[PDB]
Scaffold this active site. Sequence first.
Site, PDB file in Angstrom:
ATOM      1  CG  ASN B 393      12.927  -2.690  -0.052  1.00 43.99           C
ATOM      2  OD1 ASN B 393      12.829  -3.589  -0.905  1.00 43.99           O
ATOM      3  ND2 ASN B 393      11.916  -2.332   0.735  1.00 43.99           N
ATOM      4  CD  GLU B 394      11.520  -7.029   0.564  1.00 45.01           C
ATOM      5  OE1 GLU B 394      11.811  -7.463  -0.575  1.00 45.01           O
ATOM      6  OE2 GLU B 394      10.354  -7.094   1.054  1.00 45.01           O
ATOM      7  CG  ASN B 442       9.056  -4.231   2.935  1.00 47.95           C
ATOM      8  OD1 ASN B 442       9.984  -4.382   2.109  1.00 47.95           O
ATOM      9  ND2 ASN B 442       8.736  -3.048   3.449  1.00 47.95           N
ATOM     10  CE1 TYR B 448       4.171 -10.992  -1.318  1.00 49.81           C
ATOM     11  CE2 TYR B 448       3.451 -12.806  -2.713  1.00 49.81           C
ATOM     12  CZ  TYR B 448       4.019 -11.537  -2.573  1.00 49.81           C
ATOM     13  OH  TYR B 448       4.438 -10.783  -3.671  1.00 49.81           O
ATOM     14  CD1 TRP B 527       4.153  -3.605  -3.030  1.00 51.08           C
ATOM     15  CD2 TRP B 527       5.352  -1.761  -2.566  1.00 51.08           C
ATOM     16  NE1 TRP B 527       5.154  -3.497  -3.974  1.00 51.08           N
ATOM     17  CE2 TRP B 527       5.908  -2.383  -3.707  1.00 51.08           C
ATOM     18  CE3 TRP B 527       5.953  -0.595  -2.065  1.00 51.08           C
ATOM     19  CZ2 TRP B 527       7.027  -1.862  -4.382  1.00 51.08           C
ATOM     20  CZ3 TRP B 527       7.067  -0.064  -2.737  1.00 51.08           C
ATOM     21  CH2 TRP B 527       7.586  -0.698  -3.893  1.00 51.08           C
ATOM     22  CE  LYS B 548       1.603  -8.025  -3.488  1.00 50.03           C
ATOM     23  NZ  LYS B 548       2.329  -8.415  -4.758  1.00 50.03           N
TER      24      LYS B 548
HETATM   25 CL   LIG Z   1      21.331  -8.912   0.091  1.00 49.91          CL
END
Ligand SMILES: [Cl-]
Lengths: 661, 661
Positions: B393-394, B442, B448, B527, B548
């Site tokens: 994830n990310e 995501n 944002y 999310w 959220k």
């Molecule tokens: Cl990373």
Amino acid sequence: SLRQDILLNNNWNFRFSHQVQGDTRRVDLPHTWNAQDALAGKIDYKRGIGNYEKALYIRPEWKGKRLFLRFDGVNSIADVFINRKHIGEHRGGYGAFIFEITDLVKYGEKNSVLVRANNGEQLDIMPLVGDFNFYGGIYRDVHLLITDETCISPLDYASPGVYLVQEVVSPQEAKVCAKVNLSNRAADGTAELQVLVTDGTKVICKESRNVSLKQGADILEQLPLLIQKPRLWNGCEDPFMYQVSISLHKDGKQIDSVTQPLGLRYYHTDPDKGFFLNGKHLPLHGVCRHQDRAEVGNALRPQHHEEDVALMREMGVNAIRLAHYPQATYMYDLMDKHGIVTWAEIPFVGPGGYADKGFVDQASFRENGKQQLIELIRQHYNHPSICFWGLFNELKEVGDNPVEYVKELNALAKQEDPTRPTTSASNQDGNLNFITENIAWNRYDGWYGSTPKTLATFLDRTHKKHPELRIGISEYGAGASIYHQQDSLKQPSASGWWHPENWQTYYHMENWKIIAERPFVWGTFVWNMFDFGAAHRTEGDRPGINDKGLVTFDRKVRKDAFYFYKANWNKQEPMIYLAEKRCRLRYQPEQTFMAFTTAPEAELFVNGVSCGKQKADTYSTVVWKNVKLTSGENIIRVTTPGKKPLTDEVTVEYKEDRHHH
Amino acid sequence: SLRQDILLNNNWNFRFSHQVQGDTRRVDLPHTWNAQDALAGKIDYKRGIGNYEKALYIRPEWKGKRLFLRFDGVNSIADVFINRKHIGEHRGGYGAFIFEITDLVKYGEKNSVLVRANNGEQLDIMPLVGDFNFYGGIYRDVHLLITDETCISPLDYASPGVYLVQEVVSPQEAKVCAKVNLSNRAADGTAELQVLVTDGTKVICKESRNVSLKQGADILEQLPLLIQKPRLWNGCEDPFMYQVSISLHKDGKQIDSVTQPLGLRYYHTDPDKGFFLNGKHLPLHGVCRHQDRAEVGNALRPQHHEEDVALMREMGVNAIRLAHYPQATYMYDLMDKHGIVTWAEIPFVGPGGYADKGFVDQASFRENGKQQLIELIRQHYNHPSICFWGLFNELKEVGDNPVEYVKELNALAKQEDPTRPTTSASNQDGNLNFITENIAWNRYDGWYGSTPKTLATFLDRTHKKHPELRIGISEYGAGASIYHQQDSLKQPSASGWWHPENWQTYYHMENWKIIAERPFVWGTFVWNMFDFGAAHRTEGDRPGINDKGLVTFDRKVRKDAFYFYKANWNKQEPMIYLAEKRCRLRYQPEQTFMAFTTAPEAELFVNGVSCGKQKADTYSTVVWKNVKLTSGENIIRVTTPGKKPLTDEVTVEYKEDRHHH
Ligand SMILES: [Cl-]
Ligand SMILES: [Cl-]
């Protein structure tokens, strides 16, 4: 010239004074800065100054009107500044207060309002100690009130300015003295004061007087009202109230108006027979309630008050002790509306089993306590639900002896309001018990050591030795975590980290049976309807919580005891509830199942096969003994009689393992 | 010789090692020591060693059996001692682990079990960073497992020891390879391994093999199963599973047994058409869910998992991303049972908008990550709900570049389990997106910064430029406090202390419309289903919370967005819900009212007088515009058509005041 009431809750700028830089963050009221620290069990949570500032545009058309900032509650000292100039201070965390700002603002521009709130410790503002959190900040609403230059005054201890004094009340007739504060800032003149009592669209009273008002006048006017064959506020049976409109008129125009409820009733407490409302005996099935909640602290929103009352009525509550301090006007409104007999009290709280004192014998402390009492009585005078004024909780004579001072408060209460009796909540023997008209004790027999049976001995012995006392129970309860479950009944250590829910259930069942048999006990109040915050607590399933609630802190989960009371106190809503469902793991070879129901009997099924019917006892409890479970999963179901029954059901796991024996 | 599974959750003695004295307090599992500090927003919450010790009586009749301590989860390093002698260590906060203690205990006496759990920071155990709390301690169950000396082994990465490998599955027939770990500590001998597949009382398969087991043998045996015309696990439509009993027999006695589910299905993801379950297109209406809750942190009880699933099914959820780590066996069981297609992932989490890295390029970190992946796959292999393995994830390439290492994890996942595709959740452009079989991003367009419309542009442009990608949305959402309400729609600052609920509602309505129109998007996951803990957050209505959620942290309050999704995703439960009921104060002269319903139209009433009917749109929304309120209180009611309608109702206050304009 209609009176305006403008909410100022949104978008204030906040910083602590310990943050010296001057940067601020947005906050929105109601707000406390102790909703995280105190609720996490931090015993030295932030107690000091928090600063809130907001720009307020003062409309050019408000020139010629009067302008007031009214605060419903700031804990515990508030210093208010307009354009950074000090306008006043209020000392006391629970009463409303108000400042006129008419001559202090610049019309047609933005003016700064700054509130510096301080919840730092003091020895001159009750409460000095207590088993609850002293959450700091502007935790109730703030309003800008706009009125005519000649108005029904908002300036008498921030009260509505009208006292509907009930002088004689019976089913044949009621006489009421409407006392009305008038305030004039316009030129010398006369006006017409009108008091109008209605029931829906029907006029019941209408009285008028001409009044002469000097410039700068602040006076009290009194108008008699007579109502023949009144409809009385009669608790939950008929919580009826008339509406009263008080208005000022000049040359055919209404210039100001306020409305207040009129709920007529009369009552008395008999030392042998208990409490009588409107000439009829009424058992007071009471609980206590603090003004806090999980996550938000005491920064309660109206839906929070609404939900708390909904849960109490569901359980069949008909009496409440709003401990340990004056609570929201909206909460007393909901008590009026729902018929709940209310004990309202000032925060004169003693230490209990802890250190320090509730009373410090110095003039500053004593004079402030009298101002807190006058605030409570004047601000909340018109709520029919309020039937007792509580003057203290658990003071003690050792050291500074508050006896003489409590006699002063009693005499002041009786002078301000001869229409309600005084009461108090005691944990001591001796003289402190013989001052207020009604007396009550906080008792934990079967929780803080002993057996519930010593409550019976105490009540009987006290009643026999002192037959003139009107004895109540101002607190009784036991702790429970919904996450602490065990198959067997055993008394836990009160101060320990294990509070099995079944012990709380047992405690309330036994104590209630003692109470139910003793009609000389005028009222009893469970400590507490809800789990609540107390940062110094280190017991049950987490620090910082008093877990004596019948319902959890977030108001989500009703503990078994809630349904025991619901079955016994709310007999007109059919229900069945299986006890001990949260105890999913069973070890005992011989299982007992217990249900609370309003039905005369119930039937148990195990794994889809009936174990037969059992009768409900006098306390709405059905019990099956020596129930045999099969190893592993078992489905347990209980049903009421008839072809359309109510049911309750749980799956438990039965295990033959353990540990030595 | 029936296998025993004994829960050891009660009454452990706890202290932190920073408390040097040696005094302990009772705790009961599941337990985290970060349920107060991290949840209050303390950013430097306690991360270090907590010690749990319990006396365990080892029964004399267990001599000759094998004994195992199995831990469902300890965050994040656990060192286990028996009679104060070290027996082993586990590194990783989310996978189960086990130690055999057969030869390490004294039979017929109390033996000490000591667990020293450490959640202190490390650079060699993922997750290294993340927008969630690293709650420390023994936060899942502990079991003592007792087996025959010859058993189906519990020692293969603490898995059940049976892998029901689905080799071919169609409606005509299924072939399964039952791989079974066997472990022998008795003398050299033979035994009979039996695999029995049932549906209720009906036998579907029965296969047997004789196996030779040397003393000290630990071996893998494989038995083929064939099922003709199988009933398939088909998601929420028919979440059917067979039961499989695996047993060992000797001389006409069963000596050991375990059971596992068999839920047969097949699936694929098409880059243009989305996800297909058992040959049929299935939109994945997904949400994400963290394993924490208000007040208790990650120390979740079974009723917590049960309630979370109940709330998701109520909303019509049919897919879930259990982010960001392996979750409880019971949670995957509930996903199996309810038909929810599940994305399960290891905690290889990157920093998002925050500092530091999810990947540190050192062998210790890399080898531990592979062991966490093998744990996830082996421990949770048999759950039909799990249809994707998420690998990260990310992560980001800058600094230590995890691309090559993520290719290693992908190849390891495919080798351990060729029957599920891999996936990942990305917030980057470039090579990290081209490793796993399915990819997802995501996206927070309209939260944002930007407008929801840029989600549509991103999806369309990505799909056109890279037509081979199977594109999903692994996160999309917006913050909301139920206590932040305003009459008008305006976009708040994401990082600020004002998160009005209406903006979250608007965000989800617009984003959902974009998603609904794009069937190439194989799955989307909100999310988040619930508000959750993240100590460093400083936004919305309180610090320490990611708000959220569609539902609040204590699971008590469903936000308006929940009902928008419920009306659109759960079309067979009739409902109507008035939006914006928590917005009690209205200022706009022209009011808009909005309801979500499964009905084709609805009728609005204001103060008891109909404003007329409006039709529901394609998204189950009914809207009335230019509704005129009267100053003061207004009762607003909406009803569905027919003589037995469903209703929703609210009282609001309309005020003509304000502030400059
Ligand atoms: Cl990373
Ligand atoms: Cl005292």
